[PDB]
Design a protein around this ligand. Structure first.
Ligand SMILES: Cn1c(=O)oc2cc(S(N)(=O)=O)ccc21
Length: 209
């Protein structure tokens, strides 16, 4: 059972701007997604401070980076708080409408796309390098869901029947044909060292056969 939704007009405009603007510094997508994962891990850690049972779905707080050259996917996995179905539909738990408004005013006033994260809509920087993005997520208060969009004004949400995750979020980037450098081990390490050196959770870069 697959539900198809239209993006709010402002969010469709944001993804069009990300996809169509000439902007060479695409590597910041990874910083933005890792920062999102850190934020989600902060949230479940804070909740566990007064209620330890919130970690019954998994005690480890970490971030894994999983490149797959056969599938041409880069997957960012975290064991953070996750998102409910309502969160997914409401722009993946962001205030994307007012964030897009502020971001686009900043762009016409000196800013560049690399500062997208200061406006709370850094997730959509995934479309700098991905033709399609799948988000698998599991929140303690809801079931496991899959969100997916190839932009173009719509996204889908369905119940996920894949591997159960316990708790957290998995962002699967289906990379553009000319963006496969972000599957290379040395390129990912360089980006993590450059932009994510002070993230307070272990980041594990998986290797391939
Ligand atoms: C293939 N794959 C995937 O799609 O998500 C994964 C998560 C893990 S984890 N973080 O549990 O080691 C390991 C492998 C995968």
């Amino acid at each position: 059972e697959v539900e198809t939704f239209a993006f709010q007009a402002e969010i469709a405009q944001l993804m069009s701007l990300i996809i169509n603007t000439f902007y060479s510094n695409k590597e910041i997508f990874l910083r933005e997604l890792i920062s999102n994962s850190s934020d989600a891990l902060d949230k479940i850690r804070y909740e566990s401070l007064t209620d330890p049972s919130k970690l019954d779905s998994g005690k480890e707080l970490h971030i894994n980076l999983i490149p797959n050259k056969q599938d041409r996917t880069l997957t960012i996995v975290d064991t953070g708080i996750g998102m409910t179905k309502a969160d997914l539909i409401n722009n993946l738990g962001t205030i994307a409408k007012s964030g897009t408004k502020a971001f686009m005013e900043a762009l016409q006033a000196g800013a560049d796309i690399s500062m997208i994260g200061q406006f709370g809509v850094g997730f959509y920087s995934a479309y700098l390098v991905a033709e399609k993005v799948t988000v698998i997520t599991k929140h303690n208060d809801d079931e496991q869901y899959a969100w997916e969009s190839s932009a173009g004004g719509s996204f889908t949400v369905r119940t996920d029947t894949g591997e159960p995750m316990g708790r957290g979020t998995k962002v699967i980037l289906h990379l553009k044909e000319d963006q496969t450098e972000y599957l290379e081990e040395r390129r990912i390490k360089e980006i993590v060292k450059k932009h994510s050196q002070f993230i307070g959770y272990p980041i594990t870069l998986f290797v391939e056969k």
